[PDB]
C-alpha cells in the first residue's frame, strides 16, 4: 500500500529514488513537509523537512527545486538550508557561551522562501507529488541522489590549505583584537549613570559582561560579657548551675 | 578489625549442619565395624598356596612392587581381629559439604602377634599387609553379598594418599540404607603397631635392602602407617585444652583446597602432599613454642584469624627445606634447628619422623611462596579481600594458577623397552629410593629442570596426568595401557611459572674458566653436551654459556626445556606446547630486520620512534618563538607501549600511526578570551612553528589537520609532522586558559544544558590533562611489569576482532589490562602472554558492575592508595551509582590514583557494547573450563562472533595495506613485502586518504547520526583482523529495543521514517543501508541484511 | 503488565523517552502511596531523562509538581516551584501551577499566584490575565474580573490592547453579561473597523450568547459598510445556513438585492 501519502498533522510524505548498490536490486527514502510561521526573520513562510539525506546541502536542493520548477510550473525562491543539523555538532555554542559578542529540532532541515505564493505553489505541487508517487512508482518527481557528500567526506584527510587558513585566522584575529580593545576602552573610559553614579571598575578588567557575570557569581565581634543584662543572664546561669 | 570475623561466621554457616550426614553414616559405619567385629580369624597358611587359593577366586591379590616370589617369603602370614578406632575427619569435625567428597578415618592397626623385631625390611610386611587386605576384602565381599547391600555400594582397592606402599579399601555409594546425595568414598585403612623397634630403622638414614642408599621415604611410610596415633592423642589433648582448632583447620583445609594442596603426595608427580592434619600438627607444634628459644608463636588468647595469621607468618618467615626446620617431640618443647635436608622437613623426635616428607621440594617451595603471597595480601589494612583470598578456587585451571605448560609424551613401550626408549638411569640405587618408573622420572625431571633453568624461572611444578589411585577388585595392579606404556600416568605436565625478566635472555651462564676444570664446569659440560662452550664477552670474561637462538613465536624457555628433555630422560619422546605459538602469530609481526628472530619482549621499535621524537624535541627547543615552549610531552600509545603495530617507520596504514604530543608554552597572560579565538591562536602558533620548520629543517615535512575528538569546538587543528627517520607526530597546544574557559562555560551555560558541556569537559580532561599522568604512570610501570605491552596488544586485537573499539577507548582497554597486573592476587604476576590474557578474561568474566567498582593503584611491587583516598573513591562510586540505578548509561568504574572520579574513560560506551563484552568474557571462560586449550579453541576464541545481528557489510578498499602498515605476512621472502613497503613519503600529502581507511571515522559519523536507533561497529585494524591480503573490513549494527516495530509518528522520533499506518512508522532499512553503501560506494563491495 | 521493580527498570532501559512509561513508573508509587520514595525516584528521573526533548522534560516536571501538589505542602511546593522556574520555563510552570492549584482546590495560593504571575508574564502576553478573569467569573467575581481591563492595558504595551478587550469580551460573552459585554465590544468597534475578524467573531459570540432579537439586528446592521466579496460570503453564509439551522424572506431578498447595491 502506497496510496497512504499524507499524515494527520499536515505531513507530506515525500519519497525519492536511490542509486544502484552492486548487490541491491525498494529505494524509499521518506521525508516529511509542512508550512510554518513566525514573525522573526528565520521562521516566516518556512518548511520543516524531516529524515534528511546525508549531507543535504545547498546545491542539490537548488537543483531539486529547479527540477520541480521546470517540471510542474511552480515558482520558488530558495536561498539557504536553515538550521541544517544532521550530525549534531552545533547545538550548544561554546564561543557564544563564554564570549563578549557573536552571541546567540533534530534532523529537521528548515527552509524558507521569499514569496508565500511561491511556497504555497510548491506546497500544492508537493502534495500532488506525494500522491503521484502514491499512484505510480515509475514516473517520479525526483531528487536524484547527487553527491557532494563525497566532496566533503571522502577527502577529509586533506591538509587544510595553508595560505587560506593563514588569511582566515589573520582576519579573525584582526577583528577580534579590534572589538576587544573597543570593549575594554568602553569599560574603563568613563561610566556615569543617568544620574550621578560613577561605576567602580578594576585596574585591568575588560568587559561589562565580565563585571556583570562576576557580580552575578557573587550573589562576629559580639561579646559574651560587658553588659548588665549579660550579668542578669550569667547570674541566672550561676544560680541554675 | 571488625567485619572479617563476620565473614568468618559466614563461612561457618556455609560449612555447618553436618548432623544430617554424620549421624546416619556413623550409624552405618557402626553396622560396618560390627560386621568387622564378627569377621573372625584366618590363621597362618602358606603364601605359595594362597596364591592358588586366591587364583580362581575373583580376588586376585594386589601387591606392592614387586610381587613376593616365595624364595624368601618366610614371614608369619597371619590374620587376627585388629583394633578398631573411629578417628580423624569425622571425629575432629572438619567436614565441608564438597560435591566431590569428604574423606573418613577408620583405623585398623595390626595386632601384636603377627610380626617380629626385624619385620621392617624389604616390604614383605607390606606384602603381608596386601594379602591381609586381600582376605579382608574377600571375606567382606561374601559377607556383604549375603547381606545383599551390594545394590548401591562398590568397594575398591585404592592407595592411601597415592602411595603404592599403602593400599586402602574405599567404598563408593550410588543410587533406607543408601547414602548418595552428598560426599563419597568412605575408606578403611589398616596400620602397624604402636611402638616396636628402637628408632634407628625409624630414622630417615636406613636401608637394609641389598647392595647404603637410604630409604627415608619408606621408613617414613611405615612409620606413618604406625605412629599417627600419638598425633591424634596430641590433637585431642589440645582439643580438650581449647577450641579454636576446628574452625582454624576448616579454614586451613578450605584455603589449601583452593590452592590445590591436598594431602596425597607430590613425590608421585602431582601438586599436593600438604594437608589438613599437617596444618593441625604445625598449629599445635607452634602452641608450646616455635621460636629458637621456644618462644610461644601461638596462644589461644586470639581466635582463628590471628592463629591463621601467625601460622602463615611462621611458615613464610621460617624455612623448612634448605636452612632450618621445626623440631618438636610429642612426649616437650619445640624449636628451630639450623640446616635443611634438601626436602620439606620438620622433625618430631618422639617418633623420629619427618611429617612433611609426603610432598617434594618444589611443592614446599611453591607453598612457602603462597604463604608469603597471602601474607602480603592479608597483613594490609587498606582494603578487604576475603573473597580474593578464600572464595575463589584457583585450582580450577592449569594455565591460570600456573604461567605456561608443557606436556611431555613419552612412548617408552615396555619396562624392558626402557633401555632403548629412554636415556634415564636404571639401577638398584634408584629403585631403592624411588617407588616406580614415574617416581624416578619425576625426581630426575625436576632436578634437571631445576638445574637447566635455575635463574630462569620462578618455580617449577611437575605433575604426571593420567595418574589414578584406582584399580579394581579383580585386578592385581593398575593394569592400564597408558598410551605407550603400562605405568600409572599418561603424560607429564611440566608447569612453569617464570621470573619474567629473564625469559628471552639468550645466554645462560655457567662458571668461568680456570685451567683446572673443576667439578662445576665439568657437570655443566656434561649436562649441556656439544652445545655449550666457553666464550669471551665485552667485559672480557671467559665463561661457560650457550647461545639460545630466540624466535618470535617460540620463547627460548621451550627450546631449553626441549633439550633438557630430549637429552637426558629420553631420546625420542616429544613435547606438546602449541598455545604460545598459536597466539604468537595472532600477534602482528612488524617488518623489522630479523623480526622473526626478535623476541616479543623487545621494544626496539618504540625506542626507535623515541629517538626520532628526541631529535625532533631538540630541533623544536633550539629555535625561537614569540612565546617560548614551556614543555612538550608525548602522550602517544607508542610512547606508552600499547599500539597494535609495533611501530615500523613509514607505516601510514595504521590509524594510530600519528602519535600525539601535547605542547604548552609558558603562562603568558596575553591570550584571547573566547574559546574559538584561543584555539585559533593556538593554530597561529602551530602555523608559526611549521613555517620555521619548513624554513630551517626542510627534511621534516608537515601539514595541518582538523580534530573533532572534542565536541563543539569547530576551530581546533593539530599539527602533523613527518620525520625523515620515518614517523608521524600530532601536536596539540595546551594552555593554562582552556581549563578555566571550560569551567566558566560550564558555569554560565543554561541549566538544562549542563551535563552535555560537562561531557565535553570530561572528554577534554581525558584527552589533554589526565592523559599525561596516565601515560607517565603506566609507561613507568611497564618496565616493572614486562609482559604488559604483549598482553595489551593481544587484548586489543582480540577486542577489535570482536568489534568493540568503535565504542570503547584504548586507555580504557589499557586500564582493564593493567588490572590483573597491579592487583594479581591471589595469583602471580603473569610471566607469560597466555597467563596474562586468560587472567584478564577470567577477571572480567568474574567482574560485576552494580556492586563492583574497580580501584587500582599503578604502583611498583613489594605513592600507593591509602585508606582515606580509597574511601573517597568508594564513596563517590556509591553516590554515583545510587544516582545511577543499574548502569543505564554508566557501565564501568575504573578509578586510579590519577583519577579518583573514575568516570573519565568509562563514559560514552553503550550498554549493549558493555554487556556484550561481559557476555563474551563469560562465554570465553565457559569455553576454557569446558573444552580445554587447543588450536581450534584459540581460533574459536578469535572467531568474529558476527552473530548476524541485523547487519553485515563487507568492505574492501582498492588496495591491500599490510605491506604498507608494516606488519609482514609470514612470507617466504622479505623482498616480496619490501618492494611494496612504503619506504618513502608520498609527496602530495592528500593521498593518505586512499593509502589509509575511512571506515572507523565514517562509522563514527554514522553512529552519531543514528545515536538512538542503531549502534554500529567496524574493524578498525583493517587486515590485522581482515585476513592476509589486508583488505577485509566489516560494518555491523545492533538496532535499539525501542524500534522493534512501528511507532506513533511524532517530531521527536528523529529516525528513519516509513509510515506503514497513518499513525505508525518504521525504518526504511533497505534505504538507509543503501545510503550507507552509497556513502561508501567505492569502499563497499558486499552487503547482507540480517 | 508492569509488576516488579526489575520489570519497571527493564521498561525504562528499553524505553528511554516515553512519558507514558515514565509516569507509569511514577504512578506505581503514587498508587502504592509510597510517594516520598516516588520523590527520590523523581530526583532520579529528572536527572536521568534525556535533555533534548523539551515536551518530555515538561512532562517530567509537570509530573513532579503534580506529586507535590497532590500530597505535598506549600513550603516544599514553593521550593520545587522555584527549582522548576530555575530549570525550565517559569511561565509554563506558572500556568500548570495555576491549573493544578485550582484542580487541587486551594484558592489561598491560587488567587495570589494568579496576581503575581499575571503581573510577571502579562506585559508580553494576555493569557495569564484572561485565565484569571475566566476563573474569577467562574467563581462569581463578575465585576472584579471586569475591573481587570485597566490592569491589562497598563501591563501590556500598545500592540495587543485590541487583544485584551478582545479576550475579556470573549469570556464576558462566554458566561459574564451580554449587554455589558457589548459595552466592552464598543471599544473594539470604535477603535478598529478594518480588522475583519472582530466583527465576525463578535456576532458569532452574539450567536453563542443567543439573544435572538439583537442577533436579527446585529447581522442586519453590519451590512451597510464597505463589504468585499469574501466578507460578504462569510457573513451571508453564517446568517443563511444558521437560519437553515419573518426574516428568511427578507434575507432571501437581500441575497439578490445587495448584489446590485
To the question of domain B947-1090 being in CATH 3.30.70.3030, the answer is yes
DSSP 8-state code for residue A230: H
Q: Is B717 on the interface with A (CB under 8 A)?
A: yes
Chain C interface disruption, residue of B749, B750, B751, B912, most C CBs within 10 A: B751
Q: Helix, strand or coil for residue A61?
A: helix
Q: What is the CATH number of the domain that holds A157?
A: 6.10.250.2760
Query: A108 and A17 in one domain?
Result: yes
DSSP B765: I
Instruction: Give the domain B1-16+192-201+242-397 fold.
Output: Poly(a)-polymerase, middle domain (1.10.1410)
Domain segments of chain B: what residues? 1-16+192-201+242-397, 17-191+225-241, 398-506+550-576, 577-946, 947-1090
Whether the CB-CB separation of B108 and B83 falls below 8 Å is answered with yes
Instruction: Measure the CA–CA gap between B882 and C185, rounded to whole angstroms.
Output: 60
Q: Rounded distance, CA C206 to CA C111, Å?
A: 30
Interface test with B, best of A49, A147, A154, A214 (most B CBs within 10 A): A154
For residue B1011, the distance in angstroms to the closest alpha carbon of chain C comes to 13
Q: Residue B64 phi/psi, 5° resolution?
A: -85, 155
Q: Is B540 left (phi over 0), alpha (psi -120 to 50) or beta?
A: left
Mapping DSSP to helix (H, G, I), strand (E, B) and coil, where does residue B573 land? coil
> B1039 to chain C: nearest residue by CA?
C14
Cα distance between residue B264 and residue B252, in whole Å: 16
DSSP strand pairing (B491-497 vs B459-465):
antiparallel
Same domain? For A47 and A68 the reply is yes
Same domain, A110 and A121: no
Query: Sheet containing B1033-1039: which strands, arranged edge to edge?
Result: B1014-1018, B1033-1039, B951-955, B1084-1089
Exposure string of B454-474, with b = 16+ CB inside 10 Å and e = fewer, is: eebbbbbbbbbebbebebebe
Do A95 and A6 lie in one domain? The reply is yes
Asked if residue A199 is part of any domain, the answer here is no
Q: Which residues of B touch C (CB under 8 A)?
A: 751-753, 755-756, 883-886, 888-889, 911, 1012, 1041-1042, 1052
Please tell me if residue A85 touches chain B, with a CB cutoff of 8 Å. no
Quote the CA–CA distance of A64 and A53 in Å, as a whole number: 13
Distance CA(A150)–CA(B515), nearest Å, equals 79
Q: Which long-range contacts (CB under 8 A, 24 or more apart) does B146-155 make?
A: B147/B35, B149/B177, B152/B177, B152/B178, B152/B180, B155/B473
**Cell representation of residue B840:** 584478564
Residue B624 · residue B691 · CB < 8 Å: no
- CB-based contact B1014:B1040 (threshold 8 Å): yes
Q: How was this structure determined?
A: cryo-EM
Is C17 within 8 Å of B1052 when comparing Cβ atoms? yes
If asked whether residues A7 and A64 sit together in one domain, one would say yes
Shortest distance between the Cα of B707 and any Cα of chain A, in A, equals: 10
DSSP C193: S
Query: Closest Cα partner for C218 from C196, C234, C230, C202?
Result: C202
Rounded Cα distance, B64 and B127, in Å: 6
Pairwise CA distance, residues B617 & B611, whole Å: 9
Query: In this structure, what DSSP letter does residue C159 have?
Result: G
CA distance B575 to B578: 9
Q: Distance between CA atoms of B14 and B16, rounded to whole angstroms?
A: 6
- List, as ranges, residues 55-84 from A with C-beta within 8 Å of B: none
- Cell 525504562 sits on residue: C12
Residue of A nearest to B684 (CA): A169
Residue numbers in B near C56 (CB within 8 A): 1052
B1060, three cell numbers: 506503514
- The tally of domains found in chain A comes to 2
CA distance linking residue A105 with residue A86, whole number of Å: 10
Contact C16 B753 (CB under 8 A): no
- DSSP designation for B61: P
Burial (CB < 10 A; 0-12, 13-18, 19+), residue B375, is middle
- For residue B113 the three cell numbers come to 602377634
What cell was used for B466?
Answer: 593420567
Residues with Cβ within 8 Å of residue C192, at least 6 apart in sequence: C162, C198
Inform me whether the C-beta atom of residue C17 falls under 8 Å from chain B C-beta atoms. Answer: yes
* DSSP summary character for residue A53: P
| CA nearest to B465, candidates B441, B494, B498, B497 | B494
- As given in the structure block, the three cell numbers for residue B346 are 620438620
Contact B953, B1086 (CB under 8 A): yes
Pairing of strands B507-512, B543-547: antiparallel
Q: How far apart are CA B386 and CA B801, in angstroms?
A: 36
Facing residue for C51 by CB, picked from B756, B883, B1041: B756
Question: Is residue B748 within 8 Å of residue B757, measured between CB atoms?
Answer: no
What does the radius of gyration of chain C's CA atoms come to, in whole angstroms?
25
DSSP string, B406-464: EEEE-----TTTHHHH--S---HHHHTTSSSHHHHHHHHHHHHHHHHHSTT-SEEEEEE
Q: Is C55 on the interface with B (CB under 8 A)?
A: yes
Report the C-alpha dihedral over residues B139, B143, B149, B151, rounded to 10 degrees.
Answer: 50
Taking CB atoms and an 8 Å limit, are B755 and C53 in contact across chains? no
Q: Which of C144, C192, C197 is nearest to C171 (CA)?
A: C144
* Same structural domain, A43 and A125: no
Q: How far apart are CA A124 and CA A131, in angstroms?
A: 11
- With b for 16 or more beta-carbon neighbours within 10 A and e for fewer, the B853-873 pattern comes to bbbbbbeeeeeebeeebbeeb
- The answer to whether position A69 is within a domain reads yes
d(CA B1015, CA B1007): 6
**Which of B752, B755, B885 is the closest to C9 by Cβ?**
B885
C-alpha span between B976 and B968 (Å, rounded): 10
Q: Do A29 and B675 touch (CB under 8 A)?
A: no
Answer whether C14 touches B (CB < 8 Å).
Answer: yes
A48 and A107 assigned to the same domain? yes
For residue C108, with 0-12 CB atoms within 10 Å meaning exposed, 13-18 middle and 19 or more buried, which class applies? exposed
Contacts of A216 (CB under 8 A, 6+ apart): none
> In Å, what is the CA distance from C184 to each residue of B682, C146, C165, C174?
67, 9, 7, 13
CA separation for the pair A218, A216 (Å, rounded): 5
- Give dist(CA B600, CA B577) in Å, integer: 18
How many pairs of residues across B and C have Cβ atoms under 8 Å apart? Answer: 34
> For residues B196 and B117, what is the distance between their CA atoms, to the nearest angstrom?
7
Q: Do the domain assignments include residue A234?
A: no
Residue B676 sits at the chain A interface (C-beta within 8 Å): yes
Beta bridge partners of B509: B545
The three three-digit cell numbers of residue B609, written as one number: 620512534
Cα–Cα distances in angstroms (integers) from residue B679 to residues B627, B714, B741, in the given order:
15, 9, 11
A106 touches chain B (CB under 8 A): yes
Cell 472584579 belongs to C144
CB atoms within 10 A of CB B884: 18
Q: Which of residues 21-40 of A touch B (CB under 8 A)?
A: 21-24, 26-32
Contact call for residues B358 and B161 (beta carbons, < 8 A): yes
Q: Nearest-CA residue of chain B relative to A152?
A: B1079
| Residues in chain C within 8 Å Cβ distance of B1041 | 14-15
Cell, residue B184: 563419597
CA distance B887 to chain C (A): 9
Angle at the Cα of C18 from the Cα atoms of C16 and C21, rounded to 5 degrees = 90
How far is C99 from chain B, CA to nearest CA, in Å? 24
Determine whether A188 is exposed, middle or buried from the number of CB atoms within 10 Å of its CB (0-12, 13-18, 19+). middle
Other CB atoms within a 10 A radius of the CB of residue C120 amount to 16
Q: Collapsing DSSP states into helix, strand and coil, what is residue C24?
A: helix
What phi, psi does C179 have (nearest 5°)? -75, -35
Q: Are residues A101 and A139 in the same domain?
A: no
Same domain, A136 and A108: no
- Best to test chain A binding among B672, B1078, B1087 (most A CBs inside 10 Å): B1078
Option in C9, C15, C51 nearest B752 (CB): C51
A87 in contact with B, Cβ within 8 Å: yes
B747 at A interface, C-beta within 8 A: yes
What's the CA gap between B508 and B524, in Å, rounded?
11
Q: Are strands B717-723 and B727-734 parallel, antiparallel or unpaired?
A: antiparallel
Query: Are C100 and C84 within 8 A, CB to CB?
Result: no
Residue B559: C-alpha distances to residues B79, B547, B549, B964 (Å): 56, 11, 9, 33
Let me know if residue A134 belongs to a domain: yes
Q: Which residue range forms the structural domain that includes residue A141?
A: 115-174
Binary contact (A88, B1071; C-beta < 8 A): no
Cα–Cα distance for residue pair B836/B788, rounded to 1 Å: 8
Ramachandran area for residue B947 (φ above 0: left; ψ -120 to 50: alpha; else beta): left
CB-based contact, B1009 to chain A, within 8 Å: yes
Amino acid at each position: 500500500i502506497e496510496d497512504i501519502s499524507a499524515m494527520k498533522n499536515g505531513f507530506i510524505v515525500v519519497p525519492f529514488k536511490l542509486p544502484d548498490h552492486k548487490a541491491l536490486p525498494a529505494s524509499l527514502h521518506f521525508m516529511f513537509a509542512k508550512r510554518h510561521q513566525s514573525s522573526n526573520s528565520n521562521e516566516s513562510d518556512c518548511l520543516f523537512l524531516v529524515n534528511l539525506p546525508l549531507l543535504s546541502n545547498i546545491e542539490h536542493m537548488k537543483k531539486f527545486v529547479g527540477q520541480l520548477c521546470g517540471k510542474y510550473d511552480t515558482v520558488s525562491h530558495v536561498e539557504e538550508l536553515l538550521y541544517n543539523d544532521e550530525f549534531g555538532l552545533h547545538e550548544v555554542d561554546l564561543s557564544a557561551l563564554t564570549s563578549d559578542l557573536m552571541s546567540s529540532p533534530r534532523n529537521t532541515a528548515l527552509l524558507k522562501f521569499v514569496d508565500a505564493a511561491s511556497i504555497n505553489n510548491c506546497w500544492n505541487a508537493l502534495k500532488k507529488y506525494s500522491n503521484l508517487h502514491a499512484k505510480h512508482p515509475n514516473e517520479l518527481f525526483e531528487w536524484t541522489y547527487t553527491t557532494p557528500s563525497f566532496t566533503t567526506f571522502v577527502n577529509f584527510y586533506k591538509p587544510l590549505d595553508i595560505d587560506y587558513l593563514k588569511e582566515d585566522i589573520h582576519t579573525h584575529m584582526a577583528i577580534f583584537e579590534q572589538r576587544e580593545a573597543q570593549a575594554q576602552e568602553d569599560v574603563q573610559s568613563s561610566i556615569v549613570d543617568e544620574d550621578g553614579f560613577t561605576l567602580v571598575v578594576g585596574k585591568n578588567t575588560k568587559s561589562l559582561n565580565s563585571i556583570r557575570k562576576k557580580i552575578l557569581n557573587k550573589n562576629k565581634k559580639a561579646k559574651k560579657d560587658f553588659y548588665r543584662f549579660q550579668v542578669r543572664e550569667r547570674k541566672k546561669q550561676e544560680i541554675n548551675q | 578489625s571488625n567485619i572479617f570475623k563476620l565473614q568468618i561466621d559466614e563461612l561457618l554457616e556455609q560449612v555447618k549442619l553436618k548432623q544430617k550426614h554424620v549421624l546416619k553414616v556413623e550409624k552405618f559405619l557402626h553396622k560396618l565395624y560390627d560386621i568387622l567385629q564378627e569377621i573372625p580369624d584366618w590363621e597362618e597358611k602358606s603364601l605359595a598356596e594362597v596364591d592358588s587359593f586366591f587364583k580362581n577366586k575373583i580376588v586376585s591379590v594386589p601387591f606392592v612392587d614387586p610381587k613376593p616370589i616365595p624364595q624368601n617369603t618366610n614371614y608369619k602370614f597371619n590374620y587376627k581381629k585388629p583394633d578398631i578406632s573411629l578417628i580423624g575427619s569425622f571425629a575432629l569435625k572438619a567436614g565441608i559439604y564438597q560435591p566431590n567428597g569428604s574423606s573418613i578415618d577408620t583405623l585398623l592397626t595390626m595386632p601384636k602377634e603377627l610380626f617380629e623385631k626385624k619385620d621392617f625390611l624389604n616390604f614383605r610386611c607390606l606384602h603381608k599387609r596386601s594379602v591381609y587386605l586381600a582376605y579382608l576384602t574377600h571375606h567382606l565381599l561374601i559377607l556383604l553379598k549375603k547381606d545383599k547391600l551390594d545394590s548401591f555400594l562398590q568397594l575398591e582397592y585404592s592407595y592411601f594418599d597415592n602411595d603404592p606402599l599403602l593400599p586402602i579399601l574405599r567404598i563408593s555409594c550410588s543410587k533406607d540404607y543408601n547414602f548418595y546425595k552428598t560426599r563419597f568414598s568412605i575408606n578403611l585403612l589398616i596400620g602397624f603397631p604402636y611402638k616396636v623397634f628402637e628408632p634407628k630403622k625409624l630414622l630417615p638414614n636406613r636401608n637394609c635392602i641389598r647392595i647404603l642408599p637410604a630409604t627415608p621415604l619408606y621408613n617414613f611410610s611405615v612409620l606413618s602407617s604406625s605412629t599417627h596415633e600419638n598425633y591424634l592423642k596430641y590433637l585431642y589433648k589440645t582439643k580438650k585444652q581449647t577450641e579454636s582448632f576446628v574452625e582454624a583447620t576448616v579454614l586451613g583445609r578450605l584455603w589449601l583446597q583452593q590452592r590445590g594442596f591436598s594431602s596425597n603426595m607430590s613425590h608421585s608427580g602431582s601438586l599436593g602432599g600438604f594437608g589438613t592434619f599437617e596444618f593441625t600438627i604445625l598449629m599445635a607444634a607452634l602452641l608450646n613454642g616455635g621460636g629458637i628459644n621456644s618462644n610461644k608463636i601461638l596462644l589461644h588468647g586470639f581466635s582463628s584469624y590471628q592463629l591463621f595469621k601467625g601460622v602463615i607468618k611462621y611458615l613464610a618467615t621460617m624455612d623448612l627445606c634448605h636452612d632450618g626446620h621445626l623440631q618438636f617431640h610429642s612426649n616437650p618443647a619445640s624449636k628451630y634447628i639450623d640446616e635443611g635436608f634438601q626436602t620439606p622437613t620438620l622433625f618430631d623426635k618422639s617418633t623420629k619422623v619427618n611429617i612433611l616428607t609426603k610432598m617434594t621440594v618444589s611443592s614446599y617451595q611453591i607453598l612457602k611462596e603462597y604463604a608469603g603471597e597471602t601474607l602480603r595480601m592479608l597483613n594490609n589494612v587498606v582494603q578487604d579481600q576475603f573473597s580474593n583470598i578464600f572464595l575463589t578456587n584457583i585450582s580450577r585451571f592449569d594455565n591460570l594458577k600456573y604461567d605456561l605448560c608443557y606436556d611431555v609424551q613419552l612412548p617408552l613401550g615396555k619396562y624392558n623397552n626402557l633401555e632403548t626408549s629412554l636415556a634415564a638411569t636404571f639401577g638398584s640405587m634408584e629403585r631403592v629410593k624411588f617407588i616406580t618408573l614415574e617416581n624416578f622420572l619425576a625426581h630426575k625431571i625436576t632436578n634437571v629442570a631445576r638445574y637447566a633453568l635455575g635463574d630462569r624461572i620462578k618455580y617449577i611444578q611437575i605433575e604426571m596426568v593420567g595418574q589414578k589411585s584406582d584399580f579394581p577388585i579383580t585386578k592385581r595392579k593398575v593394569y592400564s595401557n597408558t598410551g605407550g606404556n603400562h605405568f600409572n600416568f599418561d603424560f607429564v605436565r611440566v608447569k612453569l611459572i617464570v621470573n619474567p625478566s629473564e625469559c628471552d635472555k639468550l645466554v645462560t651462564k655457567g662458571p668461568a674458566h680456570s685451567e683446572t676444570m673443576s667439578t662445576e664446569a665439568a657437570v655443566f659440560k656434561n649436562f649441556w653436551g656439544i652445545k655449550s662452550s666457553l666464550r669471551r664477552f665485552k667485559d672480557g670474561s671467559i665463561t661457560h654459556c650457550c647461545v639460545w637462538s630466540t624466535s618470535s613465536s617460540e620463547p627460548i624457555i621451550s627450546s631449553i626445556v626441549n633439550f633438557a628433555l630430549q637429552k637426558h630422560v629420553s631420546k625420542k619422546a616429544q613435547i606438546s606446547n602449541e598455545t604460545i605459538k598459536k597466539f604468537h602469530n595472532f600477534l602482528p609481526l612488524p617488518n623489522l630486520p630479523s623480526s622473526a628472530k626478535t623476541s616479543v619482549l623487545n621494544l626496539s621499535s618504540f625506542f626507535n620512534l623515541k629517538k626520532s621524537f628526541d631529535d625532533l624535541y631538540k630541533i623544536i627547543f633550539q629555535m625561537k618563538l614569540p612565546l617560548s615552549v614551556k614543555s612538550i610531552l608525548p602522550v602517544g600509545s607508542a610512547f606508552r607501549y600499547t599500539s597494535l603495530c609495533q611501530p615500523v617507520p613509514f607505516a601510514y596504514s595504521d590509524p594510530d600511526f600519528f602519535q600525539d604530543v601535547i605542547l604548552e608554552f609558558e603562562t603568558s597572560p596575553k591570550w584571547p578570551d573566547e574559546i574559538t579565538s584561543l584555539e585559533k591562536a593556538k593554530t597561529a602558533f602551530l602555523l608559526k612553528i611549521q613555517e620555521e620548520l619548513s624554513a630551517n629543517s626542510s627534511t621534516y615535512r608537515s601539514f595541518f589537520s582538523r580534530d573533532e575528538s572534542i565536541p563543539y569546538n569547530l576551530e581546533i587543528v593539530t599539527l602533523n609532522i613527518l620525520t625523515p627517520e620515518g614517523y608521524g607526530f600530532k601536536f596539540r597546544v595546551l594552555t593554562e586558559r582552556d581549563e578555566i574557559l571550560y569551567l566558566r562555560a560550564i558555569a554560565n551555560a543554561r541549566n538544562e544544558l549542563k551535563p552535555e558541556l560537562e561531557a565535553t569537559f570530561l572528554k577534554f580532561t581525558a584527552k589533554y590533562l589526565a592523559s599525561v599522568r596516565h601515560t607517565r604512570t603506566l609507561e613507568n610501570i611497564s618496565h616493572s611489569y614486562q609482559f604488559y605491552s604483549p598482553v595489551v596488544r593481544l587484548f586489543k586485537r582480540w577486542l577489535d576482532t570482536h568489534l568493540l573499539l568503535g565504542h570503547i577507548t584504548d586507555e580504557l582497554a589499557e586500564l582493564i589490562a593493567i588490572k590483573p597486573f597491579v592487583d594479581p592476587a591471589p595469583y602471580f604476576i603473569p610471566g607469560s602472554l597466555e597467563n596474562g590474557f586468560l587472567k584478564v578474561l577470567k577477571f572480567i568474566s568474574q567482574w560485576n558492575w552494580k556492586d563492583d567498582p574497580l580501584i587500582l593503584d599503578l604502583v611498583k611491587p613489594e605513592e600507593r592508595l591509602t585508606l582515606a583516598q580509597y574511601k573517597g573513591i568508594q564513596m563517590n562510586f556509591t553516590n554515583l551509582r545510587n544516582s545511577d540505578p543499574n548502569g543505564t548509561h554508566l557501565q564501568f568504574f575504573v578509578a586510579s590514583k590519577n583519577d579518583p572520579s573514575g568516570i573519565l574513560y568509562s563514559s560514552g560506551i553503550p550498554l549493549p557494547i558493555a554487556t556484550r563484552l561481559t557476555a563474551l568474557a563469560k562465554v570465553a571462560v565457559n569455553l576454557l573450563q569446558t573444552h580445554g586449550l587447543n588450536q581450534q579453541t584459540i581460533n574459536l576464541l578469535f572467531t568474529p562472533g558476527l552473530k548476524d545481528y541485523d547487519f553485515v557489510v563487507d568492505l574492501r578498499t582498492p588496495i591491500g595495506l599490510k605491506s604498507s602498515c608494516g606488519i609482514l605476512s609470514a612470507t617466504e621472502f622479505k623482498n616480496i613485502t619490501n618492494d611494496q613497503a612504503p619506504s618513502n613519503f608520498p609527496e602530495n600529502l592528500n593521498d593518505l586518504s586512499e593509502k589509509m581507511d575511512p571506515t572507523y571515522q565514517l562509522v563514527k559519523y554514522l553512529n552519531l547520526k543514528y545515536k538512538n536507533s542503531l549502534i554500529l561497529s567496524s574493524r578498525k585494524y583493517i587486515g590485522v583482523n581482515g585476513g592476509e591480503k589486508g583488505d577485509k573490513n566489516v560494518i555491523t549494527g545492533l538496532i535499539k529495543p525501542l524500534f522493534k516495530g512501528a511507532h506513533k509518528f511524532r517530531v521527536n522520533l528523529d529516525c528513519n521514517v516509513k509510515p506503514v499506518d497513518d499513525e505508525n512508522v518504521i525504518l526504511n532499512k533497505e534505504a538507509i543501508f543503501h545510503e550507507i553503501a552509497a556513502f561508501g560506494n567505492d569502499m563497499v563491495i558486499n552487503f547482507e541484511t540480517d | 503488565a508492569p509488576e516488579s521493580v526489575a520489570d519497571f527498570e527493564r521498561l525504562l532501559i528499553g524505553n528511554p523517552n516515553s512519558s507514558v512509561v515514565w509516569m507509569n513508573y511514577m504512578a506505581f508509587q503514587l498508587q502504592l502511596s509510597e510517594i516520598e520514595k516516588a520523590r527520590e525516584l523523581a530526583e532520579r528521573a529528572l536527572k536521568t531523562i534525556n535533555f533534548r526533548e523539551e515536551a518530555e522534560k515538561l512532562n517530567i516536571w509537570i509530573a513532579m509538581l503534580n506529586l507535590e501538589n497532590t500530597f505535598g505542602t506549600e513550603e516544599t511546593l514553593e521550593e520545587v516551584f522555584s527549582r522548576a522556574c530555575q530549570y525550565m520555563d517559569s511561565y509554563t510552570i506558572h500556568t500548570k501551577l495555576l491549573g493544578i492549584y485550582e484542580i487541587s482546590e486551594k484558592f489561598d495560593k491560587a488567587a495570589e499566584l494568579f496576581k503575581a504571575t499575571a503581573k510577571k508574564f502579562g506585559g508580553e502576553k494576555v493569557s495569564i490575565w484572561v485565565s484569571w478573569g475566566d476563573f474569577l467569573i467562574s467563581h462569581n467575581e463578575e465585576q472584579e474580573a471586569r475591573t481587570i481591563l485597566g490592569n491589562a492595558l497598563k501591563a501590556l504595551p500598545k500592540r495587543n490592547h485590541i487583544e485584551v478587550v478582545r479576550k475579556f469580551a470573549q469570556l464576558e460573552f462566554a458566561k459574564g453579561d451580554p449587554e455589558r459585554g457589548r459595552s466592552l465590544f464598543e471599544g473594539l468597534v470604535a477603535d478598529a473597523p478594518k480588522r475583519i475578524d472582530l466583527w465576525n467573531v463578535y456576532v458569532d459570540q452574539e450567536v453563542k450568547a443567543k439573544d435572538k432579537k439583537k442577533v436579527e439586528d446585529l447581522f442586519e446592521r453590519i451590512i451597510t459598510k464597505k463589504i468585499t466579496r469574501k466578507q460578504a460570503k462569510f457573513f451571508f453564509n453564517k446568517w443563511l445556513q444558521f437560519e437553515e439551522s419573518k426574516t428568511i424572506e427578507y434575507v432571501k431578498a437581500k441575497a439578490t438585492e445587495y448584489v446590485a447595491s
